[PDB]
Amino acid sequence: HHHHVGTMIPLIYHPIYSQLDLPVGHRYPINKYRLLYEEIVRQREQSEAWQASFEFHTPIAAELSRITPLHDPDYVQALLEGRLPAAKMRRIGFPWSKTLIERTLHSVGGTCLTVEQALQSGVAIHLSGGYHHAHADFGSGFCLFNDLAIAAHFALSLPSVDKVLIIDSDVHHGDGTATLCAERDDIITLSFHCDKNFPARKPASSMDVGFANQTGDEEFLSTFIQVVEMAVNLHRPDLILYDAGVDIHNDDELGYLSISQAAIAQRDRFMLGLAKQESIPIACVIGGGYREDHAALVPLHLELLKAALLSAGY
Ligand SMILES: CCCCCCCCCC(=O)O
Ligand SMILES: [K+]
Ligand SMILES: [K+]
Ligand SMILES: [K+]
Ligand SMILES: [K+]
Ligand SMILES: [K+]
Ligand code: NA
Ligand SMILES: [Zn+2]
């Protein structure tokens, strides 16, 4: 820790993240997690800087006591037992399986580990997470349990953390996070999103910033930068949870924004740079992204790690 000149960047990953078997043609790009992992492994083999600056951590599955402070026990139990009503499971958008549940529990564990590591090192990245469409008593939009809200509540149980700011830059409104955190004064929610993307009903975050279809780089970046700087100053958080979803990209198959890969890079560089400048721990999740070829998401997500490498210089 003090042995390192510069900052070591924990990366939290579990092989179960892409182990879920989905039908060909399923909307969800399940293999992106493994593909991103494998790219990072190649980067580490080919670069001393990548090798020296990143280290992998494996999470343990979250215990139920981590999840029921946020989620209704009856909802949780229905999912654990494989008896959630069919229409509600279809709204989540996956077939039920034991592996789905196992994966979700590990990933929730993973976002929590990312918080622990960010507190220790300043910055940590979860190679999954961002399940912002899960509410207390129901799931939706590929989200069963809301890792961001769970991790924020968990963080507040730690001595150093009295205020958490969740900054959600995935193209979709963070509706589940908004409803979960509405009554918690110590968790502030900020969402940037495309108005015409899911969900149609957008319960209020602490602050919501909506964009028109085909919004471009300059508008998006200027707004994101200035709003985030203000939110950090206003709330003085002890921890930032940052959802770096790449479904804002121009070529995303669901999102309606026109953001370039270079602007994704600048977003990430600004966000990580500001956290380091202000000495605020930042726990990142990679969030969404929709491409039929799951590998096409890899370079977009990799920009988050390229940002972290650059900020990780002494
Ligand atoms: C089986 C893994 C599913 C991961 C879900 C990631 C976030 C979905 C919602 C979004 O794109 O806004
Ligand atoms: K798979
Ligand atoms: K605390
Ligand atoms: K969002
Ligand atoms: K709140
Ligand atoms: K798009
Ligand atoms: Na709220
Ligand atoms: Zn999204």
Coordinates of C-alpha atoms and ligand atoms in Angstrom, one line a residue:
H1 CA 0.0 0.0 0.0
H2 CA 2.7 2.4 1.2
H3 CA 5.0 0.0 -0.6
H4 CA 3.5 1.2 -3.9
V5 CA 4.7 4.4 -5.6
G6 CA 1.5 5.5 -7.3
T7 CA -1.8 3.6 -6.8
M8 CA -2.5 -0.1 -7.3
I9 CA -6.0 -0.6 -8.9
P10 CA -8.0 -3.6 -7.7
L11 CA -10.1 -5.3 -10.3
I12 CA -12.9 -7.5 -8.9
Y13 CA -13.9 -10.4 -11.2
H14 CA -15.4 -13.8 -10.9
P15 CA -15.6 -16.5 -13.6
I16 CA -19.3 -17.0 -13.0
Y17 CA -20.0 -13.6 -14.5
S18 CA -20.2 -15.0 -18.1
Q19 CA -21.0 -18.7 -17.2
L20 CA -24.8 -18.2 -17.6
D21 CA -26.1 -19.9 -20.6
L22 CA -28.5 -17.8 -22.6
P23 CA -30.1 -18.7 -25.9
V24 CA -28.6 -17.4 -29.1
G25 CA -30.4 -14.1 -29.9
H26 CA -30.9 -13.2 -26.2
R27 CA -30.7 -9.5 -25.8
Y28 CA -28.2 -9.6 -22.9
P29 CA -24.4 -9.6 -23.9
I30 CA -23.5 -12.2 -21.2
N31 CA -20.1 -13.0 -22.6
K32 CA -18.8 -9.4 -22.3
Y33 CA -17.5 -10.0 -18.8
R34 CA -15.2 -12.9 -19.8
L35 CA -14.2 -11.1 -23.0
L36 CA -13.2 -8.0 -21.1
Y37 CA -11.3 -10.1 -18.5
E38 CA -9.4 -11.9 -21.3
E39 CA -8.5 -8.5 -22.9
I40 CA -7.2 -7.2 -19.6
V41 CA -5.1 -10.4 -19.2
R42 CA -3.6 -9.8 -22.7
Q43 CA -2.9 -6.2 -21.8
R44 CA -1.1 -7.2 -18.6
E45 CA 1.0 -9.8 -20.4
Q46 CA 2.1 -7.2 -23.0
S47 CA 2.7 -4.1 -20.8
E48 CA 4.7 -3.7 -17.6
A49 CA 2.5 -0.7 -16.7
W50 CA -0.7 -2.8 -16.9
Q51 CA 1.0 -5.6 -15.0
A52 CA 2.2 -3.3 -12.2
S53 CA -0.9 -1.2 -11.8
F54 CA -3.8 -3.7 -11.7
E55 CA -4.4 -6.8 -9.5
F56 CA -7.4 -9.2 -9.6
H57 CA -9.6 -10.0 -6.6
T58 CA -12.2 -12.7 -6.4
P59 CA -15.4 -12.1 -4.5
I60 CA -17.4 -14.4 -2.3
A61 CA -21.2 -14.7 -2.7
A62 CA -23.2 -12.1 -0.7
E63 CA -25.0 -13.4 2.3
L64 CA -28.8 -12.9 2.5
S65 CA -28.3 -10.4 5.4
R66 CA -26.6 -8.1 2.9
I67 CA -29.6 -8.1 0.6
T68 CA -32.7 -8.0 2.8
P69 CA -31.9 -4.4 4.3
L70 CA -32.8 -3.2 0.8
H71 CA -35.0 -5.9 -0.8
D72 CA -38.3 -7.4 0.4
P73 CA -37.6 -10.8 2.0
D74 CA -40.5 -12.4 0.1
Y75 CA -39.1 -11.2 -3.2
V76 CA -35.7 -12.4 -2.3
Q77 CA -36.9 -15.8 -1.2
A78 CA -39.1 -16.3 -4.3
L79 CA -35.9 -15.8 -6.4
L80 CA -33.8 -18.0 -4.2
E81 CA -36.4 -20.8 -4.5
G82 CA -37.2 -20.5 -8.2
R83 CA -40.8 -19.6 -7.6
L84 CA -41.0 -16.0 -8.7
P85 CA -44.2 -15.7 -10.8
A86 CA -43.5 -16.2 -14.5
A87 CA -44.7 -12.7 -15.6
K88 CA -42.4 -11.1 -13.0
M89 CA -39.5 -13.3 -14.1
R90 CA -40.1 -12.3 -17.7
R91 CA -40.1 -8.7 -16.7
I92 CA -36.5 -9.3 -15.3
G93 CA -35.7 -10.7 -18.8
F94 CA -33.9 -14.0 -18.0
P95 CA -35.0 -17.6 -17.5
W96 CA -34.8 -18.5 -13.9
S97 CA -31.9 -20.9 -13.0
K98 CA -29.7 -21.7 -10.0
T99 CA -26.8 -20.3 -12.0
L100 CA -28.5 -17.0 -12.4
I101 CA -29.0 -16.7 -8.7
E102 CA -25.4 -17.8 -8.0
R103 CA -24.1 -15.2 -10.4
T104 CA -26.2 -12.4 -8.9
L105 CA -25.1 -13.2 -5.4
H106 CA -21.4 -13.3 -6.4
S107 CA -21.8 -10.0 -8.3
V108 CA -23.5 -8.3 -5.4
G109 CA -20.6 -9.6 -3.3
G110 CA -18.3 -8.2 -5.9
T111 CA -19.6 -4.6 -5.8
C112 CA -19.3 -4.7 -2.0
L113 CA -15.7 -6.0 -2.3
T114 CA -15.1 -3.2 -4.8
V115 CA -16.2 -0.7 -2.1
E116 CA -13.8 -2.3 0.5
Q117 CA -11.0 -2.1 -2.0
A118 CA -11.7 1.5 -3.0
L119 CA -11.6 2.6 0.6
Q120 CA -8.2 0.9 1.0
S121 CA -6.6 2.0 -2.4
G122 CA -8.6 5.0 -3.5
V123 CA -10.0 3.4 -6.6
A124 CA -11.3 -0.1 -7.5
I125 CA -13.2 -1.4 -10.6
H126 CA -15.8 -4.1 -10.6
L127 CA -15.9 -6.0 -14.0
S128 CA -19.8 -6.3 -13.6
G129 CA -22.4 -4.6 -11.5
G130 CA -24.7 -1.6 -12.1
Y131 CA -28.1 -3.4 -11.6
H132 CA -30.0 -0.1 -11.2
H133 CA -33.4 -1.4 -12.4
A134 CA -34.0 -3.5 -9.3
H135 CA -36.4 -2.1 -6.7
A136 CA -37.2 -3.2 -3.2
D137 CA -39.9 -5.7 -4.2
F138 CA -39.4 -6.3 -7.9
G139 CA -36.8 -6.8 -10.6
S140 CA -36.7 -5.4 -14.1
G141 CA -34.4 -4.6 -17.0
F142 CA -32.0 -7.5 -16.4
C143 CA -31.7 -6.6 -12.7
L144 CA -32.6 -8.9 -9.8
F145 CA -30.9 -7.2 -6.8
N146 CA -29.6 -3.7 -6.8
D147 CA -25.8 -3.9 -6.2
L148 CA -25.4 -0.2 -6.1
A149 CA -27.9 0.4 -3.4
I150 CA -26.8 -2.7 -1.4
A151 CA -23.1 -1.6 -1.6
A152 CA -24.0 2.0 -0.6
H153 CA -25.9 0.7 2.5
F154 CA -23.0 -1.6 3.3
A155 CA -20.5 1.2 2.9
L156 CA -22.4 3.3 5.5
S157 CA -21.9 0.6 8.1
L158 CA -18.1 1.2 7.9
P159 CA -16.5 3.7 10.3
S160 CA -15.0 6.0 7.6
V161 CA -18.2 6.5 5.5
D162 CA -21.1 8.8 6.4
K163 CA -22.3 9.9 3.0
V164 CA -22.3 8.0 -0.3
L165 CA -22.8 9.6 -3.8
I166 CA -24.0 7.3 -6.6
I167 CA -23.2 8.7 -10.0
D168 CA -25.0 6.7 -12.8
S169 CA -23.9 7.5 -16.3
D170 CA -25.4 4.4 -18.0
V171 CA -27.9 5.6 -20.7
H172 CA -30.9 4.3 -18.7
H173 CA -32.4 6.1 -15.7
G174 CA -31.4 4.5 -12.4
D175 CA -35.0 4.0 -11.2
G176 CA -34.5 1.2 -8.8
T177 CA -31.6 3.0 -7.1
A178 CA -33.7 6.1 -6.9
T179 CA -36.6 4.4 -5.1
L180 CA -34.3 2.4 -2.8
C181 CA -32.4 5.5 -1.7
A182 CA -35.3 8.0 -1.6
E183 CA -35.7 7.9 2.2
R184 CA -31.9 7.6 3.0
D185 CA -30.5 11.1 3.5
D186 CA -27.0 9.7 3.5
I187 CA -27.2 8.2 0.0
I188 CA -27.4 10.8 -2.8
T189 CA -28.4 9.6 -6.3
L190 CA -27.4 11.3 -9.5
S191 CA -28.5 9.9 -12.9
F192 CA -27.7 11.0 -16.4
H193 CA -29.8 9.3 -19.0
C194 CA -31.6 9.4 -22.3
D195 CA -35.2 10.4 -21.7
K196 CA -36.7 8.2 -24.4
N197 CA -34.9 5.1 -23.3
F198 CA -36.4 2.7 -20.7
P199 CA -37.9 3.1 -18.2
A200 CA -40.9 5.3 -19.2
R201 CA -41.6 6.0 -15.5
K202 CA -38.6 7.7 -13.8
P203 CA -39.0 8.1 -10.0
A204 CA -36.9 11.0 -8.8
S205 CA -33.3 10.6 -8.0
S206 CA -31.7 13.3 -5.8
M207 CA -30.9 14.9 -9.2
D208 CA -31.9 13.7 -12.7
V209 CA -30.4 14.9 -15.9
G210 CA -32.1 13.9 -19.1
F211 CA -30.8 14.1 -22.6
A212 CA -32.6 14.2 -26.0
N213 CA -32.1 11.5 -28.6
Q214 CA -28.9 11.9 -30.6
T215 CA -27.2 14.1 -27.9
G216 CA -23.5 14.3 -28.8
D217 CA -20.2 14.5 -27.2
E218 CA -19.9 18.2 -26.3
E219 CA -23.3 18.5 -24.7
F220 CA -23.0 15.2 -22.8
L221 CA -19.4 15.9 -21.6
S222 CA -19.9 19.5 -20.5
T223 CA -23.1 18.6 -18.6
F224 CA -21.6 15.5 -17.0
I225 CA -18.4 17.3 -15.9
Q226 CA -20.1 20.4 -14.5
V227 CA -22.9 18.5 -12.8
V228 CA -20.6 16.0 -11.2
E229 CA -18.2 18.6 -10.0
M230 CA -21.1 20.5 -8.4
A231 CA -22.5 17.3 -6.8
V232 CA -19.2 16.4 -5.2
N233 CA -18.8 19.9 -3.8
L234 CA -22.4 20.1 -2.5
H235 CA -22.5 16.7 -0.9
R236 CA -18.9 16.1 0.2
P237 CA -19.3 12.3 -0.1
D238 CA -17.0 9.8 1.7
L239 CA -17.4 7.4 -1.2
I240 CA -18.5 7.6 -4.8
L241 CA -20.1 4.6 -6.6
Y242 CA -19.7 5.2 -10.3
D243 CA -21.7 3.4 -12.9
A244 CA -19.7 3.6 -16.2
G245 CA -22.3 2.0 -18.5
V246 CA -21.3 2.2 -22.2
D247 CA -24.9 2.0 -23.6
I248 CA -24.5 5.8 -24.2
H249 CA -22.2 4.9 -27.2
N250 CA -23.3 5.9 -30.6
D251 CA -23.5 2.3 -31.9
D252 CA -25.3 0.9 -28.9
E253 CA -28.3 -1.2 -30.0
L254 CA -30.6 0.1 -27.3
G255 CA -29.4 3.5 -26.2
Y256 CA -30.4 6.6 -28.3
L257 CA -27.4 8.8 -27.5
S258 CA -24.6 9.6 -30.0
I259 CA -21.5 9.4 -27.7
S260 CA -18.1 8.5 -29.2
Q261 CA -15.6 6.1 -27.6
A262 CA -13.3 9.0 -27.2
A263 CA -16.0 10.9 -25.2
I264 CA -16.5 7.7 -23.0
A265 CA -12.8 7.9 -22.4
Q266 CA -12.9 11.5 -21.4
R267 CA -15.9 10.9 -19.1
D268 CA -14.0 8.2 -17.3
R269 CA -10.8 10.2 -17.1
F270 CA -12.6 13.2 -15.6
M271 CA -14.5 11.1 -13.1
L272 CA -11.5 9.1 -11.8
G273 CA -9.4 12.2 -11.9
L274 CA -11.8 14.2 -9.8
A275 CA -12.1 11.5 -7.2
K276 CA -8.3 11.4 -6.9
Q277 CA -8.0 15.2 -6.8
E278 CA -10.5 15.4 -3.9
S279 CA -9.2 12.3 -2.1
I280 CA -12.6 10.5 -2.3
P281 CA -12.6 6.8 -2.7
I282 CA -14.3 5.7 -5.9
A283 CA -15.8 2.2 -6.5
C284 CA -16.7 1.7 -10.2
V285 CA -19.1 -0.7 -11.9
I286 CA -19.2 -1.2 -15.7
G287 CA -22.9 -1.2 -16.1
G288 CA -24.8 -1.8 -19.4
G289 CA -24.1 -2.0 -23.1
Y290 CA -25.9 -3.8 -25.9
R291 CA -24.3 -5.2 -29.0
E292 CA -25.1 -8.5 -30.7
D293 CA -21.4 -9.2 -31.0
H294 CA -20.6 -9.1 -27.2
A295 CA -16.9 -8.4 -28.0
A296 CA -17.8 -5.1 -29.5
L297 CA -18.4 -3.7 -25.9
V298 CA -14.8 -4.6 -24.8
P299 CA -13.0 -1.5 -26.1
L300 CA -15.7 0.7 -24.7
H301 CA -15.4 -0.7 -21.2
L302 CA -11.6 -0.9 -21.5
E303 CA -11.6 2.9 -21.5
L304 CA -12.5 2.8 -17.8
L305 CA -9.3 0.9 -17.1
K306 CA -7.2 3.2 -19.4
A307 CA -8.6 6.1 -17.3
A308 CA -7.7 4.4 -14.1
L309 CA -4.1 3.6 -15.3
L310 CA -3.6 7.2 -16.2
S311 CA -4.9 8.5 -12.8
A312 CA -2.8 5.8 -11.1
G313 CA 0.5 7.5 -12.0
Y314 CA 2.4 8.9 -9.0
Ligands
LIG1 C1 -26.8 -11.5 -16.1 C2 -26.2 -10.1 -16.0 C3 -27.1 -8.9 -16.3 C4 -26.4 -7.6 -16.0 C5 -27.2 -6.3 -16.1 C6 -26.5 -5.0 -16.2 C7 -27.3 -3.8 -16.3 C8 -28.5 -3.9 -17.1 C9 -29.3 -2.5 -17.2 C10 -28.8 -1.4 -18.1 O1 -28.2 -1.7 -19.2 O2 -29.1 -0.3 -17.9
K2 K -22.2 -17.7 -21.6
K3 K -20.6 4.9 8.9
K4 K -28.2 6.6 -15.7
K5 K -31.5 10.0 -0.7
K6 K -26.9 4.9 -29.7
NA7 NA -34.4 9.1 -4.8
ZN8 ZN -28.3 0.8 -19.5

